[PDB]
Amino acid sequence: MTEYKLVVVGAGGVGKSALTIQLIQNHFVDEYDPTIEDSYRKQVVIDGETCLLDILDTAGQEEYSAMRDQYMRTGEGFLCVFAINNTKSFEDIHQYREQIKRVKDSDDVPMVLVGNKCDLAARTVESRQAQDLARSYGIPYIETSAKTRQGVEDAFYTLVREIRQH
Numbered sequence: 001m002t003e004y005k006l007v008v009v010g011a012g013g014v015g016k017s018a019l020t021i022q023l024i025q026n027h028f029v030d031e032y033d034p035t036i037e038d039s040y041r042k043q044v045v046i047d048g049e050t051c052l053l054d055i056l057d058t059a060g061q062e063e064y065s066a067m068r069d070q071y072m073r074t075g076e077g078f079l080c081v082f083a084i085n086n087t088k089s090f091e092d093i094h095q096y097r098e099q100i101k102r103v104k105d106s107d108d109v110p111m112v113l114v115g116n117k118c119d120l121a122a123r124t125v126e127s128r129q130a131q132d133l134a135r136s137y138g139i140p141y142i143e144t145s146a147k148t149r150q151g152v153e154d155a156f157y158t159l160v161r162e163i164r165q166h
């Protein structure tokens, strides 16, 4: 079947793993559990097409840029995740996107800007700012909460749809 290699990237602690585990295992991981490098494979039906989501959950730690560079190279689409309560992670987004473009040798890689932890009331990144950033990237912006599952399927499925029309 069609396989979509999705890569989740972003600063440490923004909820990359929580988003992935919510998608694959339908539960919120309320646990401190830093990722080194984890792969998830799930058979899903998306818009009637049986496909295999191969999700690459990367580390936010800078000490694993080498492991990120290797598995960013093979990814077809990228979830660039920041936390709406963490302004620094929103600023780090530009660094992750530039790194994706260099390893992919491409200015138009399938990507979704993900503003995670939107359940939190102490927002520091206005939705308008992140939407403008996504607009200048030419990529969709989707706010998610791995806690409430809001937007989780939307973020991943939108990325798959970008890969189809790429």
Ligand SMILES: Nc1nc2c(ncn2[C@@H]2O[C@H](COP(=O)(O)OP(=O)(O)NP(=O)(O)O)[C@@H](O)[C@H]2O)c(=O)[nH]1
Pocket: 010, 011, 012, 013, 014, 015, 016, 017, 018, 019, 029, 030, 031, 032, 033, 034, 035, 036, 058, 059, 060, 061, 116, 117, 118, 119, 120, 144, 145, 146, 147, 148
């Ligand atoms: N309130 C709330 N907390 C969240 C959300 N997503 C993740 N978290 C919390 O944020 C913390 C970090 O989550 P985690 O998924 O491990 O983030 P990460 O980006 O994978 N970190 P790393 O880069 O080290 O792997 C955890 O305590 C987790 O429960 C969310 O949508 N809402």
Ligand SMILES: [Mg+2]
Pocket: 016, 017, 018, 033, 034, 035, 057, 058, 059
């Ligand atoms: Mg993680």
